[PDB]
UniProtKB/TrEMBL annotation:
<feature type="binding site">
    <location>
        <position position="233"/>
    </location>
    <ligand>
        <name>Mg(2+) 1</name>
    </ligand>
</feature>
<feature type="binding site">
    <location>
        <position position="163"/>
    </location>
    <ligand>
        <name>Zn(2+) 1</name>
    </ligand>
</feature>
<protein>
    <recommendedName>
        <fullName>Genome polyprotein</fullName>
    </recommendedName>
</protein>
<feature type="binding site">
    <location>
        <position position="358"/>
    </location>
    <ligand>
        <name>Mg(2+) 1</name>
    </ligand>
</feature>
<feature type="binding site">
    <location>
        <position position="235"/>
    </location>
    <ligand>
        <name>CTP</name>
    </ligand>
</feature>
<feature type="binding site">
    <location>
        <position position="160"/>
    </location>
    <ligand>
        <name>Zn(2+) 1</name>
    </ligand>
</feature>
<feature type="binding site">
    <location>
        <position position="155"/>
    </location>
    <ligand>
        <name>Zn(2+) 1</name>
    </ligand>
</feature>
<feature type="binding site">
    <location>
        <position position="236"/>
    </location>
    <ligand>
        <name>CTP</name>
    </ligand>
</feature>
<feature type="binding site">
    <location>
        <position position="305"/>
    </location>
    <ligand>
        <name>CTP</name>
    </ligand>
</feature>
<feature type="binding site">
    <location>
        <position position="170"/>
    </location>
    <ligand>
        <name>CTP</name>
    </ligand>
</feature>
<feature type="binding site">
    <location>
        <position position="409"/>
    </location>
    <ligand>
        <name>Zn(2+) 2</name>
    </ligand>
</feature>
<feature type="binding site">
    <location>
        <position position="237"/>
    </location>
    <ligand>
        <name>CTP</name>
    </ligand>
</feature>
<feature type="binding site">
    <location>
        <position position="538"/>
    </location>
    <ligand>
        <name>Zn(2+) 2</name>
    </ligand>
</feature>
<feature type="binding site">
    <location>
        <position position="232"/>
    </location>
    <ligand>
        <name>Mg(2+) 2</name>
    </ligand>
</feature>
<comment type="subunit">
    <text>Interacts (via N-terminus) with serine protease NS3.</text>
</comment>
<feature type="binding site">
    <location>
        <position position="359"/>
    </location>
    <ligand>
        <name>Mg(2+) 2</name>
    </ligand>
</feature>
<feature type="binding site">
    <location>
        <position position="384"/>
    </location>
    <ligand>
        <name>CTP</name>
    </ligand>
</feature>
Length: 582
């Protein structure tokens, strides 16, 4: 309690001594409340005019148009302490999993240089505004790095002064850049050195890319076993227990010297004890604390979510196989059986999973998994939209399974080669591309964001008739040489000025380990679509009058956007499609 957080709290009080007050009408039950002070402030979604002018049929589709308009009663909840048998299963599995992840990797500190190049290339690091304007400016200024040193030496001393969360089923906890640096220094290696790559972690998909996920699910399908299970957790981040935070901290056991002390401090002082500042309109700043739940940087969060999810799912698999009888208490022979299971088949059981943070797909040994619920419920990883003790409903076809907001189709090319392609409801794809984040976008910057969406569609969703046509139209409407941009940046092979047919060949043929025949594709017409009926099932407007007028008159929409942007060098990509090829 207050010895670890007091200094952070004491320091905040003094900068707002002309406001402090212990309010007695504070809404917090599960968050420890400390005091309040005076403020007054709020970022809504803006429409991308280049994308919207080139997708006119969707102007009358509510699922698209509503996306551009616009629970914290889940953050103020508590999770019970697991039983002793559950805690033992988790500690033993966590110990074994950090060992496996560490067999071919070396933990190491990330550097001011690595951090500097990150901010100078626009990764969403979740910092705040204040003494410097942007993150770009603070990084080129030794004043900052002296503040970072003060905090750093404080951490080595086992104390914290300035590592405070700012709160804003989504809730994102910004820290000042300096705090983000010390987190990145201690734990950035997990992401930077690909600890959750498939090659290293066997369940993981970190860095795989949306063009590999479908092939990965198909490889899991090839295993002998039961249905494929894809149970979502109800508010994963709010269900992370202090016991989970302590099993995650065991990664420091693989570390040494300075690194071990810096990493232990981030875990102790910022994760297992948190200080948070929240806005309350009643507008005061509430300074609140708690020990449990997830509040890290979004990238360390991804890695620790993958870790703890892998652990939970192996334990659920153990329960389905009857490795242990009861979560109440693990016998001594049951611990030995859990350890022997992990040594004998642990790696085979990891390869039956695809896990991305809180998202998973498991192909267990058989369907006893469906009703193995006691450990999963007692760890607090309660399934979304199903009664606590109702058995999971599995999928019989890998092309039906949901994963990372997608499903995957098997698509046979005119030459017999097999593509496994990602897909989702087309209203979701068009609706997202019509949205921009932030203020002060020039027309040029708005056009270059539209071009990023268009190139993503050409690479990933080429098999959707409407998206190949709209992607070609947007690339025709934006100057040929203008570089695709994004303000928050899986692999992103569409972020290039190289010709998209050449990128398609590299991604889908040359570098695709599931394609034996490396014969390049010579034109877009060699690259197939979904069946017309499947395309309509996944949201295509093919067959509608509005869509036929749009397609036929597309050069008029292209010329409207060219006229707005002005006298520039443009390319006509529309003859890359059969129907416009004369
Ligand atoms: C663009 C281009 N597309 N084509 C093309 C592609 C496939 C078949 C046919 N007949 C033509 C070109 O010759 C140039
Ligand atoms: Zn600190
Ligand atoms: Zn689909």
């Amino acid at each position: 309690n207050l010895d670890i957080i007091g200094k952070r709290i004491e320091k905040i009080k003094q900068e707002h001594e002309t406001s402090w007050h212990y309010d007695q009408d504070h809404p917090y039950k599960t968050w420890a409340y400390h005091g309040s002070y005076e403020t007054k402030q709020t970022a809504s979604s803006m429409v991308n005019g280049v994308v919207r002018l080139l997708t006119k049929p969707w102007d009358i589709i509510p699922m698209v148009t509503q996306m551009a308009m616009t629970f914290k009663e889940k953050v103020d909840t508590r999770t019970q302490e697991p039983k002793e048998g559950t805690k033992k299963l988790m500690k033993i599995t966590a110990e074994w999993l950090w060992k496996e992840l560490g067999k071919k990797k070396t933990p190491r500190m990330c550097t001011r240089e690595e951090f500097t190049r990150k901010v100078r290339s626009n990764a969403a690091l979740g910092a705040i505004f204040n003494k410097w304007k942007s993150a770009r400016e603070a990084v080129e200024d030794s004043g900052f790095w002296e503040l970072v040193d003060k905090e750093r030496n404080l951490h080595l001393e086992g104390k914290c002064e300035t590592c405070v969360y700012n709160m804003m089923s989504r809730a994102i906890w910004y820290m000042w850049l300096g705090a983000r640096f010390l987190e990145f220094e201690a734990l950035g290696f997990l992401n930077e050195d690909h600890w959750f790559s498939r090659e290293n972690s066997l369940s993981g998909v970190e860095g795989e890319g949306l063009h590999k996920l479908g092939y990965i699910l198909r490889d899991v399908s090839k295993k002998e076993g039961g249905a494929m299970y894809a149970d979502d957790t109800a508010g994963w981040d709010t269900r992370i227990t202090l016991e989970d935070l302590k099993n995650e901290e065991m990664v420091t056991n693989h570390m040494e010297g300075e690194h071990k002390k810096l990493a232990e401090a981030i875990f102790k002082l910022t994760y297992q004890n948190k200080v948070v500042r929240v806005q309350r309109p009643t507008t005061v700043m509430d300074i609140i604390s708690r020990r449990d739940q997830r509040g890290s940087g979004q990238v360390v969060t991804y890695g620790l979510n993958t870790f703890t999810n892998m652990e939970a799912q192996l334990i659920r698999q153990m329960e389905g196989e009857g490795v242990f009888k009861s979560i109440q208490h693990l016998t001594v022979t049951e611990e030995i059986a859990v350890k022997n299971w992990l040594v004998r088949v642990g790696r085979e059981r990891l390869s039956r999973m695809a896990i991305s943070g809180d998202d998973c797909v498991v192909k267990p040994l058989d369907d006893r998994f469906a009703s193995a619920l006691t450990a999963l419920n007692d760890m607090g990883k309660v399934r979304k939209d199903i009664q606590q003790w109702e058995p999971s409903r599995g999928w019989n076809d890998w092309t039906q399974v949901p994963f990372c907001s997608h499903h995957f189709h098997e698509l046979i090319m005119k030459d017999g080669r097999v593509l496994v392609v990602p897909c989702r409801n087309q209203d979701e794809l068009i609706g997202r591309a019509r949205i921009s984040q932030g203020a002060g976008w020039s027309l040029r910057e708005t056009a270059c964001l539209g071009k990023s969406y268009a190139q993503m569609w050409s690479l990933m969703y080429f098999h959707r008739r409407d998206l190949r046509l709209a992607a070609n139209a947007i690339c025709s409407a934006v100057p040929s040489h203008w570089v695709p941009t994004s303000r928050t940046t899986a692999t992103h092979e569409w972020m290039t000025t190289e010709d998209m047919l050449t990128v398609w060949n590299r991604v889908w043929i040359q570098e695709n380990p599931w394609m034996e025949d490396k014969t390049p594709v010579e034109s877009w017409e060699e690259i197939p679509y979904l069946g017309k009926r499947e395309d309509q099932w996944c949201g295509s407007l093919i067959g509608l009058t509005s869509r036929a007028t749009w397609a036929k008159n597309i050069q008029t929409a292209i010329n409207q956007v060219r006229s707005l942007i002005g006298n520039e060098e443009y390319t006509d990509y529309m003859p890359s499609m059969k129907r416009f090829r004369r």
